Structure 1
């Protein structure tokens, strides 16, 4: 197939018929007072070195993103994409000074794009007509924004768009992951400076999923243009970013699905796991109230959740968040402290199964409940330790080198359990034999 730009006559009627949920608001519809503030906050964060390339994993291989990113949003929120959890630099919601001011700026932009999204969603329902104001308000209540930056001149060879001849790509075809169902997405595009598409100007591409026969749209983006993906547009269509010649910033505001991705959620989950622990005093004499299989199953699953979805995800970035804010320092230290107690809980469970007065039928009730969690813990620890010690992981500079936290040697006597669980896991399976 091919692609369509405003240079083509059919481009405008294709937008009307098959992309009505895509809205474009040109820079002339936004106050200059806002343009100057947002564009200066972009350069303020870039000068302070607040945008970083992520070391994600796709299909078993570790990739460095061509785009530099920083997440800004509600305090305690997270956004997960490509197996990498991003932690928000907080913006002032009611209840390092130049950096704070930038976050206030993007909170102000968040309010504006929110009102614009609600109005565009109200016009869409009226056009389709000829309780739900709750759904419209929720699908527009952006909680985070993910800032992006790329200098196209820094890349030796940019990937070509492979289906419609759209030219060089900065971000390939994808859907935005981890969004509330049918939630909108607003993007502020800030570009720094005849056969088909102008390769010098940045574009955003659009196509139908599974469809390379239907020609896709290349929407040119100038300095200050905003486009909106409404309702199920993010699900039924893929989008990409077509690279220009000059660098470009972008602020993509989303309604992240954070039902299992807020600090409050994971702290409650930790408290629920420690309800099985005599919490009179904090020492190594960990005594568990119950040994009922489902309570122990729940305990070791929460143990895996805090370790892998939060601890190792956070320190895999390597204290680079400590350049912009210290908001997560105390929480990450509290979750690590809570995690250490759960290590002693696992040791207390391993102590009970090796007790002489426990009947075999009760022992096998506990092994069946916890083996799947201990298997996943050992398997995920090997992957994470391999991610931190990969060849591409060394080439990063020192202030964002992945730390395999938490990590300890067999020497370490402060830990009650080793890091390698292969001898334990294999034993519990052997205890299931006879």
Structure 2
């Protein structure tokens, strides 16, 4: 049978040193009384204000409510995507920013303070890690450049429905074995754990488990976590090892600081993209007579791709969460209004393209060129629309509370003459395909 080790086992420390060395551990004691207080009160403050939410996530094609409740805090405009769900930051106050409710704002400041301290620690541990290998500095600093933390809460008494750990008999899992997605390559992750107050790991206490990827022969590690212990995954650990969370019996919070790989995941980035798409529009005035500067296939393809990007990675992702951030802050209210306007204009662009493709004096070579440059984009738009609407109407989603109910948005009826094109592109895509096979 597969087995596991905790500090009670003779072989624990040396197995740690041999098969999990890039896993570091700083016990509550390395951290000041002061910061412990501030940070814990900050957790309880967010919890009281109802700021943590279960994500209606996706996994092997199945909609599933995560047993754990979460919240994302970080640099303004930043996102972190896991399990097909883009979490938007509730902003903490980096330099250059000034706003979002009192006690909540103060909690954000506090997790920024925590972010700072843990960063300093991570850099020190990676320095040590290298000098241990000795027998760039900018790489280290960018691998500890935490731009977000993902907070988690679970109260096992309230959230009993928990799976047994299958390979090492670690007992009950809060979070099953996984790799953390969407992180900068080789970037560290720093977790502050806070648990509110014989053969194997003690079930009453929280543990983080690690195993080697592909491997259930090498026994796994189960590391006990009390109030205020911190652990760190350094470097390639998150890629070479898997981790899970073993549930104790008391509620527990954690702050999991990460370098989210946000090259296509920031308000700034998606605004530059929308703008790039709108470069193809005549923009003297904002009205519905949409007229484009060019129908070169490359420019049109690009436009429709950006159209999809803002619709499905930004708008539908944001509204699937049914405006639950509105509880914590309004930071994204204006930006999302603006992205919605940019997208509406793009529905305008697509319409103008469909107008061209139907234009009498257009040589069929060129028409077919247009079709072949946009067809993929439009069928992807259709398939992703079926997906999001269904995901918004699924039995599970309809049972969430009213301030969390998924919201299929934007959405308009075929009768709605405010919008230039139907929500259901099925017929249109059929038509374009048919044209493309005309002898």
- TM-score > 0.5 by shorter chain: yes
1:82 aligns with 2:83: yes
Q: Which runs of 5+ in 1 are unaligned?
A: none
Give the superposition deviation at 1:258: 0.1
- RMSD between aligned alpha carbons? 0.5
Deviations 1:1-58 (A, max 9, x none): 1000000000010001111100000001100000000000000000000000000111
Secondary structure at the counterpart of residue 289 of structure 1? coil
- Give the Cα–Cα distance (whole angstroms) in 1 for the partners of residues 209 and 19 of structure 2: 14
Deviations 1:64-96 (A, max 9, x none): 000000000000000000000000000011111
Give the superposition deviation at 1:158: 1.4
Aligned twin of 1:224: 228
Secondary structure at the counterpart of residue 67 of structure 2? coil
Give the superposition deviation at 1:155: 3.0
1:328 aligns with 2:329: no
Secondary structure at the counterpart of residue 154 of structure 1? coil
- Give the Cα–Cα distance (whole angstroms) in 2 for the partners of residues 214 and 355 of structure 1: 67
- Give the Cα–Cα distance (whole angstroms) in 2 for the partners of residues 151 and 187 of structure 1: 18
Give the superposition deviation at 1:60: 1.0
2:367 to 354, 363, 373: 363
Give the superposition deviation at 1:216: 0.3
Query: Structure 1 residues 354-363 or 154-163, which shifts more?
Result: 154-163
- Give the Cα–Cα distance (whole angstroms) in 2 for the partners of residues 155 and 399 of structure 1: 20
Deviations 1:314-359 (A, max 9, x none): 0000011000000000000000000000001000000000000000
Deviations 1:99-120 (A, max 9, x none): 0000000000000000000000
- Name the TM-score, length of structure 2 as normaliser: 0.98
Secondary structure at the counterpart of residue 65 of structure 1? strand
Aligned twin of 1:378: 382
Give the superposition deviation at 1:272: 0.3
- Give the Cα–Cα distance (whole angstroms) in 1 for the partners of residues 161 and 31 of structure 2: 35
- Give the Cα–Cα distance (whole angstroms) in 2 for the partners of residues 208 and 433 of structure 1: 52
Give the superposition deviation at 1:154: 1.8
Secondary structure at the counterpart of residue 41 of structure 2? helix
Runs in 1 of length 4+ with deviation above 6 angstroms? none
Deviations 1:267-322 (A, max 9, x none): 00000000000000000011000000000000000000000000000000001100
Secondary structure at the counterpart of residue 17 of structure 1? helix
Secondary structure at the counterpart of residue 228 of structure 2? coil
Secondary structure at the counterpart of residue 190 of structure 2? strand
Secondary structure at the counterpart of residue 165 of structure 1? coil
- Name the TM-score, length of structure 1 as normaliser: 0.99
Aligned twin of 2:143: 139
> Between Structure 1 and Structure 2, how many residues are aligned?
433
